[PDB]
Amino acid sequence: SMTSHSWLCDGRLLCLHDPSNKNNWKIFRECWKQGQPVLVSGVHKKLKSELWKPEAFSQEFGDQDVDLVNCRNCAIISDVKVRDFWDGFEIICKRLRSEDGQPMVLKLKDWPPGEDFRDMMPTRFEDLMENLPLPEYTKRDGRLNLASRLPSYFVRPDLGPKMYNAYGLITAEDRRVGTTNLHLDVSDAVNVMVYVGIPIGEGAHDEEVLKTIDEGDADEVTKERIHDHKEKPGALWHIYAAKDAEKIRELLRKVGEEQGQENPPDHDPIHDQSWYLDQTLRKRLYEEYGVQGWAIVQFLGDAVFIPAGAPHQVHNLYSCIKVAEDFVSPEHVKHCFRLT
Ligand SMILES: OC[C@H]1CN(c2ccc(Cl)cc2)NN1
Ligand SMILES: [Cl-]
Ligand SMILES: [Cl-]
Ligand SMILES: [Cl-]
Ligand SMILES: [Cl-]
Ligand SMILES: [Mn+2]
Numbered sequence: 001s002m003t004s005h006s007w008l009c010d011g012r013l014l015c016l017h018d019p020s021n022k023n024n025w026k027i028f029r030e031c032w033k034q035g036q037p038v039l040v041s042g043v044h045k046k047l048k049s050e051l052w053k054p055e056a057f058s059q060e061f062g063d064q065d066v067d068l069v070n071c072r073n074c075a076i077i078s079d080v081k082v083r084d085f086w087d088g089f090e091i092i093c094k095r096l097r098s099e100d101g102q103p104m105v106l107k108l109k110d111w112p113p114g115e116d117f118r119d120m121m122p123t124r125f126e127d128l129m130e131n132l133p134l135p136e137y138t139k140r141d142g143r144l145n146l147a148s149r150l151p152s153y154f155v156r157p158d159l160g161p162k163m164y165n166a167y168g169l170i171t172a173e174d175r176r177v178g179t180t181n182l183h184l185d186v187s188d189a190v191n192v193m194v195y196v197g198i199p200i201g202e203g204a205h206d207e208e209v210l211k212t213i214d215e216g217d218a219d220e221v222t223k224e225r226i227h228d229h230k231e232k233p234g235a236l237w238h239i240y241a242a243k244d245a246e247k248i249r250e251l252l253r254k255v256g257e258e259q260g261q262e263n264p265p266d267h268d269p270i271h272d273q274s275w276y277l278d279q280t281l282r283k284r285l286y287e288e289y290g291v292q293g294w295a296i297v298q299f300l301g302d303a304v305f306i307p308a309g310a311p312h313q314v315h316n317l318y319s320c321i322k323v324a325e326d327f328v329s330p331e332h333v334k335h336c337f338r339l340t
Contacts, residue, residue, distance in 0.1 A: 008039065009219055009294050016040040019133045019303065028134055033331050035307050037239045037294055043192050044301025046131040051124050052194040052321060058086035061120070064111075070098065071105040071169065071177055082111065089167070089319050092201030103202070107166035107179060115159040128161060128192065128323050133303050138190050138327050146328040147187070155336040157187040157326035164191075164322040169315060170205060175212055178276035179235065180314040184245060186336040187326040189306045196232040196300045197319035209317050212236060215279050216315070217295040225299060234320045237296040238277060242309030242335060245270060247289045255281065270311055277313060298322075308335035 005027055006015045014031045016024050019042045031038055050056065062083030067076055077096065085108045088095035095103035118125045132138040137145055147157055166179045199205070213223065216236045225231050240248060252269035269275055277285065285291045297317075298304050306312055309332065328336060 006221075008221055008296070012036070013294055013296065014038045016133065017042065019043050019046060019131070024134060025136065029331075032305070032307070032329065035241050035243065035310070035332075037296065037307060037310065038305040039296060039298075040133040040303040040305070041299070042301055043131060043133065043303050044194065047194060047301075048127050051127050054086050054089040054195065054197060054319075054321070058083045062086065066111050067109045068096075069107045069109055071107055071166065071179060072098075072174070076109075077106070082108070085165070089165075090197040090199050092199050092203070095167075105167045105169055105174065111165065112163060117161050117163065118159070124323075125161070128194070129325075132190060132192070132325060134190070134305070137188070137329055138325055142327070144329060146330060146333055147326070150328065150333075150336075153338050154328070154333070155186050155338065157328065160325045161323050164314075164320070164324065166316050166320060168197075168199070168318040168320070169212070170202070170208070172208065172211075175215060176276065176278040177315075178313050179316040179320075181273045182238075182248075182270060182275045182277060182311055182313040183273045184242070184270055184309055184311045185306065185326070186308055188308045188329050188332055189324050189326050191298070191304045191306065191322055191324040193234045193298050193300055193302050193320060194323055195321035196234040197321075198232065199319065209233065212315070212317060213297060216297075217279075217282065218297055219295070222295075222297050225297070232300040233297050233317050234300060234302075235298045235322070236315040236317060237298060237304060237312060238282065238293045239296060239304075239306060239310055239312040240291065240293045242307060242311075242332075244291045244293075245309065245311050247291050248285065248311055251281070251285050251289055255284075276315075308332035 003017060005017055008015050019040050028038060064082045065079055066082045067078050068085055069076060085106060092103050098104050112120045136142045249270055252275050256263050296304060
């Protein structure tokens, strides 16, 4: 029956159940003070579902010019129509094919571009911003959002939100690649899964999704959300505490060296955004450096709260539309300060 919250990651991750509850801050704020990520479920039930479909984006914006990335090999597909991405989002037989004749796993780069989301999509902007959880933290004008209140001694976030659109990774070989590589942000962020597309053609690809979640180190309760309630899983995240960022840099310098990269001893493999931690590298981080992370499956309507300074990576299971907003909480403002 209905409850305020539950725990994932064996007690280490807060899951809030009611996204608009005026009392959520009472449960949120101690987990957030400790540097933990937080999950909030149910945001899809608050949104106008017609605004967030792949077919509407194609119909309304399809003649815009964009670049795509081939997630398998990082090859850039320059200066194509955005309809060429959207029309293959769920229908595999419409997808652009690589030279080997296979349908590609594509990411749409920087769309809408820079800060243009609000100008290009005013009705979507209103629908998202009015339904974000923890609104004193996440709204542009929230009382606990310092973004508009800080001097130039602090790195300030760009005007958001930002959309993140990409197909699902499909094969056993795809398990070792990221949709978004390991990186960190100096602001806090909330990332909302507004649509999950489960394809058709080569549709029935449900067994390799279970193997990816299992190999991804997902907890036993997370595995129950599929088997028992038939929720749509979108993406597998790994998030690490901000305090563990330098130990992760030491691991990736050592692995770069082993693989014959020629790197100065101070170079920053996290800022480079060139690594995805696969099962092998995650085990090595735990065993050799004593660092544990949070493995998080983001279902349709889940909002993931990512603490400033926390290294994180994203692997899409199915085709995803995500929308994210940056904010600056008082708990984590040290991470954007420009001195010492
Ligand atoms: O029927 C029992 C109630 C419990 N509930 C709820 C209470 C507090 C928060 Cl913060 C969120 C949800 N709604 N149902
Ligand atoms: Cl709009
Ligand atoms: Cl709040
Ligand atoms: Cl990336
Ligand atoms: Cl911190
Ligand atoms: Mn990020």
